[PDB]
């Protein structure tokens, strides 16, 4: 009987963010000398040129954490992400000038990133 | 005396921290906005005596208990904030969850 | 991955079956639906979601389903449901509620709710969103009384006056067409929506019809004018003619008849009858009976809300010092006796409870305050909640029934009551963006940020020569949408069809949003919303005791409410 | 006859060779030239010589080359020099600086400086007198912030936002053009000019540049919407075609890139690199990197200036709070010790010093204070005399270089850097009178008069109620200059060419004086008056450690700064 | 603090008070304006201290008498109102002809 | 109270040398605006308790002395004043280089 004033009384249970989307693993590697960290929101294959990675496992997708939060990657260093798949029309334009258009159009994006230096385009 | 705004919008912090402590001296619980007051112009006043923010942070701590104040007042305020002229300048004090 | 909801809560605000507690009351309200897709909540800052490319569309113009503005994660309260979503805004105007962001990459966005390169963003998470307050017993008599509803959550004033005139200090009335047309000019400088209520009074239409085509809104009539069976009859053919509300403060002397002759001279039109307890002003003792009726639209005043045990003894000598009355006089002693009556106003407590009183409203400085409104709603829903448990149609042990009775009596009701809900008084699209955030903490108490016509007027907010805006001192400061000719666009002033029509914004110069009033000839209590109970009300003339369905209505005084000394510093 | 020099500075203000500290610093400037004609000094009052047949010309029309306002005997401290000389103000604009009176019997009168009937005097002998202050990175937030801003010689606001909305909060932006028009009609009542910011975001052209061609003066390119290299691009393109400023706050998350990827989305062209330290953001950690290129304008914001005992602690913890951080989460930790840095913050103080960081500006209520540009700009001077000696380009022991670097970094360089230089900036004959008159003993710290376009808008003054103006209280006040419709006349509203061409200043109903932003896209560092030097500035990202010329910079936190507890109650 | 328009207003009529207090302290007969403070200063107090109404209009008749103030001044009181938060809420207190 | 604008300026005087007076006591010299206050609230009080014109241009140079305050404020203070009601209406009071 405390009264906290304006407190919450959450109900039961837990939230599934992303619910019904592919989920992917991958390892990504900070080849740069300072610190990148990655909202949950961008492109995956759009991010820092210096973060190695299977470049073409970024497209379509972002990573699986909550809204609002960041991955972060020391200089120097490799994790695993875990990795959502965009939704809506599943376009993206801007950020890095990588897609701008369909995510469906790899080979495109692929060769692009590879042009521009984006790391681990296999 | 050149009073800026901030200096004439301050005296206000000052007058209600003096209210409040004659509240509090007569043995009322002290509510929401008289503890706010209270340690907003005890950051103040130490800013002025030329103590550091660090000691600010930690002192702002214990000006006032929870059986200083009402019901909920500890769990209603997160955190205070002053703006203080230091010897060097004006500074940031935040003091997190000051009422325990 | 899956959040607790603890955390979720704290990062996104409260999701469906979540509950959070009003202020300091007992009432507790469920989320009944979110409008979210979980995991694409938007959210604003660093690293954060609506970044171009990513939650912000960088395509699109602003024309092109882009929104002006984005609430993110509001927890709307209103008489349209207790809920989760987004809240979109264009034009002054709430446009879409459900979920913004960007389709590109987005599940679940509201077609017309992208968030673009023309889209600012008010951060909504763990905030309480309801319409602006609709205050309709406003005396103008001290401008500085327009601050104070702001703090406390009300964006439209209605009601009369001229300043501390007498007539003013008294009854809601401006009156005349030079007074009218001054006021509508002084309405251009105050940062609020209004209207103007024009003199109920005379024999003849042409005089009462003038203050109509001059620019009024509607017409009071009041017992310090002659709340006659002629004045009242008369302005409510006018109000007929000119579709106007009529609210009145009737002959509490008898002096021309009782209650059942003032519902004669009514004769089913429709009405406002203000401060249907009494206590500030009608037929004594019985006036309280207009709320059963199907005709009127019956309002509180907000100083006997709720009762308490300083209630009697402050509302005694009120009357006895505004009256200019002597302890020493029988007649005026008497006269007190009859006006002032803790059966009545125990009642009152109950008949809002049950939807038979459909608003609240202040009686701003002659006899009511101008900043509790919304404060004295909430502390007698907590009253009637502690007394009368929880009402038998509330489920999960949620209050979500109670508050949208309640939200609704200074929200949508007191709109539809003066026919101005099409522009304002609920959360729904295609209606003027006059929000208010709240802290729960904070609830009813002190607003955080008074939005008005899509622009912030009004905040809680610190040190303007601070490194942030949180340092103190915090308090209550007008902010940009008041300042130079953004008031204009961010405030409307209601009118008559007719003063419209005749061109007085243009004659007068008034560059404020202007809004038609509209639709209140053929309305009743069947139109309020959540409160639209109909019933045979008693009240015995010699014990003063209320009867609903053959039972007595009575309450305790309470010694304490919420929302009271836990906040104000004096 | 003659006057020693003690005498003669006190009754006409210094001459030349004589020197004035600066408040409570260290720091003197000295007098390099003098106008005057000694014995035919202009002065006001009683039995003085600007009386009618006398040093006022009674005969000719004010067309005649009479002025409407004489500042005599003004120490002017500008970029232009340090020297004494009256100044002639006609229709709000400077138009002569040099010797004004009545060339009917005074030698030496500049032809356009006849004080005649027309003529209103401002005693300046003894004051220090310098051109308003442009500040470039404003939040709109409070509209209090606008006095703060005047008290200490502030007179233009460049920067953006809605009120206390989130997106206001953390960047200075109006997104779209129904919030540019809302803010431009929201400026008609501030007292300061002003230019307002659009989004620079977007991957597009059109949704930006409608925000330029709706009344944007300008472009910021904030990480919170997305400082990704496409929103860096399509900004750079539109201000190209538009003739308006870009101002960026780049992605500290180095997310989408390193410093070297915006750089080369920035591909050469002009750009104005906010807060370029980084503690108020930016590619961590080297952001500062970006003041050693020619294409950068580079600005501090304030609360870094300059680096003392406090600083570190007081901006970790700034910075946790309002990105709502948590101490035990170690990633949280790790970003706040990427951004605020010792050896960038101290390496700060020398880069001013140096001439590599060419501007001041607040970052007012995002992580900076309104009105202490000005204040901080000579702590900062002080502070680098006292470690770092008299810069080897010093004279006759005064600190006149040292001066002129300072003074440009609050007044002419930010205007060059917005394309506004042409209206204010400095006091030069053709430009606005945007004044500030200091006593030496308050210079840099508190503000005597501020002149807008010729009026006084904001003075120190006593007692409305007394018999002269000088009893106390003495505070800021609000001068005839902002009240009615002098507020128009008195300040600039700074807008696109494209804007100004299309109409919408009549469109919107604007009254303000409408000022074009130009010649913004064809300057560069070597344009930064006292400010030119580009260089290659190392940042090791191991140690944090600041390299010019293979010399590390750095230098000690201060314990006590001048132009602080002397002064401030609080 | 959050404080609104009325809290803030009325801190000007504690100090108002406080410089009263003063005055009388050092044997002052108080002026109108003084005696106003005072007795409104005191009626804000008693609700915080969760005085009642009727408690408060009883008081207000005995903080000062005709000997503490200047000639003319008790007649030219004719009552002081105050209005407070007092545990129920808002409510009016008017003291009728408070200096005998 | 029927407060007029410089009733309602004065009392901020007032408000500043409290707070002056307080950091005074606990041993700190005093700056420039806290000096202003106590000597401008001096003069203040002195016209109410009904002094002269003349009896306060001599007191008010004797109410702080250079080791009261910081460095340079006696040479920053070139006069201090003030108008107040005295018995015979509002007069003007300048106290000439207040601190010696
Ligand atoms: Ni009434
Ligand atoms: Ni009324
Ligand atoms: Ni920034
Ligand atoms: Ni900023
Ligand atoms: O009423
Ligand atoms: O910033």
Redesign the pocket.
């Known amino acids: 009987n405390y009264i906290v004033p304006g407190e919450y009384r959450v109900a039961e249970g837990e939230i599934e963010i992303n619910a019904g989307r592919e989920k992917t693993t991958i390892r990504v590697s900070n080849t740069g000398d300072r610190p990148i960290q990655v909202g949950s929101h961008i492109h995956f294959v759009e991010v820092n040129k210096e973060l190695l990675f299977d470049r073409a496992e970024g497209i379509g997708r972002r990573l699986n954490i909550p809204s609002g939060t960041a991955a972060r990657f020391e200089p120097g260093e490799e994790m695993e992400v875990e990795l959502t798949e965009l939704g809506g029309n599943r376009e993206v334009f801007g950020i890095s000038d990588l897609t701008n258009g369909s995510v469906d159009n790899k080979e495109l994006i692929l060769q692009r990133a590879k042009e521009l230096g984006y790391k681990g385009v296999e | 005396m050149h009073l800026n705004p901030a200096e004439k919008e301050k005296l206000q912090i000052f007058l209600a921290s003096e209210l409040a402590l004659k509240r509090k001296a007569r043995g009322l619980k002290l509510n929401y906005p008289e503890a706010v007051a209270i340690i907003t112009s005890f950051i103040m006043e130490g800013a002025r005596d030329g103590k550091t923010v660090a000691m600010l942070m930690e002192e702002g701590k214990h000006v006032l208990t929870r059986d200083d104040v009402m019901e909920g007042v500890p769990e209603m305020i997160d955190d205070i904030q002053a703006e203080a002229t230091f010897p060097d300048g004006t500074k940031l004090v935040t003091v997190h969850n000051p009422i325990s | 991955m899956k959040i607790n909801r603890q955390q979720y809560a704290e990062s996104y605000g409260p999701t469906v079956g979540d509950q959070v507690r009003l202020a300091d009351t007992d009432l507790w309200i469920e989320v009944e639906k979110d409008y979210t897709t979980y995991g694409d909540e938007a959210n604003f800052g660093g690293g954060k979601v609506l970044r171009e490319g990513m939650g912000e569309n960088g395509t699109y113009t602003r024309t092109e389903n882009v929104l002006d503005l984005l609430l993110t994660n509001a927890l709307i309260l209103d008489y349209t449901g207790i809920y989760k979503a987004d809240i979109g805004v264009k034009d002054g105007y709430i446009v879409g509620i459900g979920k913004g962001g960007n389709p590109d990459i987005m599940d679940g966005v509201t077609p017309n709710m992208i968030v673009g390169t023309a889209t600012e963003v008010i951060a909504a998470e763990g905030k309480i969103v309801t319409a602006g307050g609709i205050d309709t ?1 406003v ?1 103008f008599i001290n401008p500085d009384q327009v601050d104070v509803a702001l703090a406390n959550g009300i964006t439209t004033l209605f009601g009369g006056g001229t300043g501390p005139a007498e007539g003013s200090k ?3 009335v401006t009156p005349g067409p030079w007074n009218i047309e001054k006021m509508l000019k002084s309405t251009e400088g105050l940062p609020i929506n209004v209207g103007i209520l024009g003199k109920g009074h005379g024999s003849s239409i042409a005089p009462i019809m003038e203050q109509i085509d001059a620019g009024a809104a509607g017409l009071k009539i ?1 017992e310090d004018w002659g709340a006659t069976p002629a004045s009242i009859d008369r302005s409510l053919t006018v109000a007929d003619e000119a579709d106007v509300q009529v609210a009145i ?1 009737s002959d509490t002397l008898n002096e021309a008849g009782f209650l059942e002759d003032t519902l004669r001279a009514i004769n089913g039109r429709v009405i406002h009858s ?2 249907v307890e009494g206590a ?2 009608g037929h004594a003792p019985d006036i309280m009976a207009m709320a059963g009726h199907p005709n009127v639209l019956p309002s509180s ?1 907000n100083p006997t809300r709720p009762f308490t045990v300083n209630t009697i003894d402050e509302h005694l000598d009120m009357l006895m010092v505004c009256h200019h009355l002597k302890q020493n006089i029988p007649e005026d002693v008497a006269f007190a006796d009859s006006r002032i009556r803790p059966e009545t106003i125990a009642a009152e407590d109950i008949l809002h409870d049950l939807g038979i009183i459909s608003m609240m409203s202040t ?1 701003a400085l ?3 305050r101008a900043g509790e409104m919304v404060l004295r709603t909430w502390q007698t829903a907590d009253k009637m909640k502690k007394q009368r448990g929880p009402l038998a149609e509330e489920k999960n042990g949620s209050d979500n029934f109670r508050a949208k009775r309640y939200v609704s009596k200074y929200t949508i009701n007191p709109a539809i009551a003066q026919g101005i809900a099409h522009e304002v008084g609920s959360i729904e699209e295609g209606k003027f963006a006059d929000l208010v955030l709240w802290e729960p903490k904070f609830f009813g108490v002190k607003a955080d940020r008074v939005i008005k016509g899509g622009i912030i007027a009004y905040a809680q907010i610190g040190d303007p020569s601070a490194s942030i805006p949180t340092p103190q001192p915090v308090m209550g400061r007008r902010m940009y949408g008041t300042v130079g000719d953004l008031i204009h666009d961010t405030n409307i002033t209601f009118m008559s069809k007719s003063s419209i029509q005749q061109g007085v914004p243009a004659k007068l110069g008034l560059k404020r949003r202007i809004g038609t009033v509209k639709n209140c000839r053929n309305i009743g209590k069947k139109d309020m919303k959540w409160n639209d109970v109909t019933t045979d009300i008693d009240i015995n003339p010699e014990t003063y005791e209320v009867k609903v369905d053959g039972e007595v209505l009575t309450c305790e005084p309470v010694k304490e409410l919420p929302m009271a000394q836990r906040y104000f510093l004096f």
């Open positions: 017993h005396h008294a009854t809601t009041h403060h203000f401060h500030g002003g005043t009686d002659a006899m009511g």
